[PDB]
From TrEMBL, chain A:
Family assignment from sequence similarity: Belongs to the universal ribosomal protein uS15 family.
GO molecular function, one term: structural constituent of ribosome
Origin species: Sus scrofa
Name of this protein: Small ribosomal subunit protein uS15m
Entry's localization field: Mitochondrion
From TrEMBL, chain B:
GO MF terms held by the record: rRNA binding; structural constituent of ribosome
Organism taxonomic ancestry: Eukaryota, Metazoa, Chordata, Craniata, Vertebrata
An example Gene Ontology biological process: translation
InterPro entries documented for this protein: NA-bd_OB-fold, Ribosomal_uS17, Ribosomal_uS17m_metazoa
Compartments it resides in: Mitochondrion
Sorted UniProt keywords: Mitochondrion, Ribonucleoprotein, Ribosomal protein, RNA-binding, rRNA-binding
Chief subcellular location: mitochondrion
Homology family: Belongs to the universal ribosomal protein uS17 family.
Lineage: superkingdom: Eukaryota
Name listed for the protein in its UniProt record: Small ribosomal subunit protein uS17m
GO CC annotation: mitochondrial inner membrane; mitochondrial small ribosomal subunit
TrEMBL record, chain C:
Residues given in the record as Mg(2+) binding sites: 12
Coverage span on the entire protein: 128 to 199 of 199
Annotated compartments: Mitochondrion
Lineage, uppermost ranks: Eukaryota, Metazoa, Chordata, Craniata, Vertebrata
Protein name: Small ribosomal subunit protein mS38
Domain of life: Eukaryota
Similarity section: Belongs to the mitochondrion-specific ribosomal protein mS38 family.
Automatic annotation (TrEMBL), chain D:
Superkingdom, taxonomy of origin: Eukaryota
Species of the source: Sus scrofa (Pig)
Part of the full-length chain shown: 59 to 116 of 173
Entry coiled-coil feature ranges: none
Signal peptide stretch: none
Compartment list: Mitochondrion
The name this protein goes by in its record: Small ribosomal subunit protein mS25
Length: 175, 112, 72, 58, 51
RNA sequence: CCAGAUCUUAAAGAUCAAAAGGAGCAGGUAUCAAGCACACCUAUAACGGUAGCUCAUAACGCCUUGCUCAACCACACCCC
């Protein structure tokens, strides 16, 4: 997560010369104080790419787009935490995650070195798509739990059989 | 010089599915099979087990497999030979230069 | 016109919705009866698992839940 | 060639090519970047194809 | 000998590829220069209004 | 791929081919959708270690049935 400082000139009114010589009044009118959420995203996107990307001037690169989507994904999550019953934005959040997931897979199969750096910097955790998407109903999860528990119990029966029964035979040898 | 095998496949090329087990990679071989009715070729997927001694398999690779002279179990009958295309790290066999899909990572016309 | 088919499907649904209402409690008895056999058959399936695995008793701490039971 | 495995790979190498794996571990690399449909078949038929005399005597 | 011929054939095509890439690379630099002037012209215009 | 049995003989040729294995092909049914130990490593041919394997391209089930024919597969009262 990132936190743009409040008293910073917005993206556009930065490179123009002669700003620091202006009085505090105009600097206040251009800072993030008098700018809406839209201007905040620009500063987040500008800073984020300058920290992880190699060539910021390239926008068509996959890594650049993944950074752009991550900014929107974080923005949607903040909106979702406030407006919980909103369904239009929840759909956007899920589709944005799926698009980033699809683009991360494409980046991995082309440039592994860049994919590793993007995955580490942004904190994204890439999980392989599990085969055979099935709905885990109560009957299946119950029976699966029993089979795993029975499997562990069989190991204990054999493990103690390996210890005690062999020792009993070895008792005759040792005497 | 008797080091033959009884399997019908001596050399095969397939994609790595997973590397969950110890020093063994499950690969998926693809072949073309003619449909008798439509007279068209479709892919048929089969899963093979290959023994990787160096643990060099990453999911998504294309691996050449060599038939094992003696099976090590009822399923492992093939041994990995080479990594044809490392995932994400693909070097063009012609120019011997790193590449990422269509765009060359390094220009082959720039020796220095 | 196609109304000769919607009307035929209208009458059948209207008569079925009266067969359920007239014998509502008969279906209640059968539904609960089938649910008990559904639960019992599930118990035998789990009982078969541990008996064939060599165990004598079910693993400790395992009480089979009643999945086909009314809850909320 | 019913017993020869043929596998396709799309958009992995900027330069199209064909690779042949022999029984003795030999690798044959065929480079195609401007050759037409007909040229490749004639090129393949000569590097690894069978001779006409061999087929007719078989 | 067929293997030897095929090896020479790849080398012959490789020389053509290296020559052709230089032509593409030279054109790419020309395209980059034209893009740079267009971007610089728009950069100057945009900064004037912000000032 | 083929041990083994047999025949011939200059002990290396041939006839039949168990077991085991797989490029592909192979009845109906998904209202049979999950099977429940079905994997692998080390050295041992133990122990120890990893937590995996098959499956919507049909696993696991159920029903019907000799066959792809110089012939092949199976049964020899019943409890495979
Ligand atoms: Mg009716
Ligand atoms: Mg046999
Ligand atoms: Mg023999
Ligand atoms: Mg003999
Ligand atoms: Mg039914
Ligand atoms: Mg009998």
């Amino acid at each position: 997560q990132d936190d743009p400082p409040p008293s910073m000139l917005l993206l556009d009114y930065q490179n123009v010369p002669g700003i620091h010589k202006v009085d505090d009044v105009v600097k206040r009118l251009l800072s993030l104080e008098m700018a809406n959420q839209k201007e905040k995203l620009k500063i987040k996107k500008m800073q984020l790419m300058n920290k992880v990307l190699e060539n910021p001037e390239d926008t068509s690169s996959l890594e650049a787009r993944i950074v752009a989507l991550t900014v929107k994904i974080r923005n949607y999550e903040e909106h979702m935490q406030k407006h919980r019953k909103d369904k239009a934005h929840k759909r956007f959040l899920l589709m944005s995650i799926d698009q980033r997931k699809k683009m991360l897979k494409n980046l991995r199969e082309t440039n592994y070195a860049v994919f590793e750096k993007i995955c580490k910097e942004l904190g994204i955790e890439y999980t392989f798509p599990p085969p055979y998407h099935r709905k885990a109903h109560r009957r299946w999860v119950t029976k699966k739990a029993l089979c795993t528990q029975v499997f562990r119990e069989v190991q204990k029966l054999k493990k103690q059989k390996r210890a005690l029964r062999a020792a009993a035979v070895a008792a005759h040898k040792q005497g | 010089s008797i080091a033959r095998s009884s399997v019908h496949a001596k050399w095969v090329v397939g994609k790595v599915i997973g590397t969950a087990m110890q020093k063994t990679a499950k690969v998926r071989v693809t072949r073309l099979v003619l449909d008798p009715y439509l007279l068209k070729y479709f892919n048929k997927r089969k899963t093979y087990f290959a023994h990787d001694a160096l643990q060099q398999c990453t999911v998504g690779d294309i691996v050449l497999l060599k038939a094992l002279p003696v099976p090590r179990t009822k399923h492992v009958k093939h041994e990995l030979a080479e990594i044809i295309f490392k995932v994400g790290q693909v070097i063009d066999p012609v120019t011997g230069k790193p590449c990422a899909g269509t765009t060359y990572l390094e220009s082959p016309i720039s020796p220095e | 016109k196609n109304i000769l088919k919607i009307r035929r499907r209208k009458m059948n649904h209207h008569k079925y919705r009266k067969l359920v209402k007239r014998t509502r409690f008969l279906r209640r008895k059968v539904r609960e009866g089938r649910l008990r056999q559904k639960q019992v058959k599930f118990e035998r399936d789990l009982k078969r698992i541990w008996q064939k695995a060599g165990l004598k008793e079910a693993p400790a701490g395992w009480q089979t839940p009643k999945i086909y039971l009314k809850n909320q | 060639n019913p017993w020869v495995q043929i596998t396709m790979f799309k958009n992995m190498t900027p330069s199209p090519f064909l690779r042949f794996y022999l029984d003795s571990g030999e690798q044959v690399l065929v480079d195609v970047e401007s050759k037409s449909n007909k040229e490749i078949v004639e090129h393949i038929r000569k590097i690894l194809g069978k001779n006409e005399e061999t087929l007719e005597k078989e | 000998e067929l293997m030897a011929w095929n090896q020479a054939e790849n080398q012959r095509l490789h020389e053509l590829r290296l020559a052709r890439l230089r032509q593409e690379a030279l054109e790419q630099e020309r395209r980059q220069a034209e893009e740079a002037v267009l971007q610089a012209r728009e950069a100057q215009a945009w900064a004037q209004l912000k000032e």
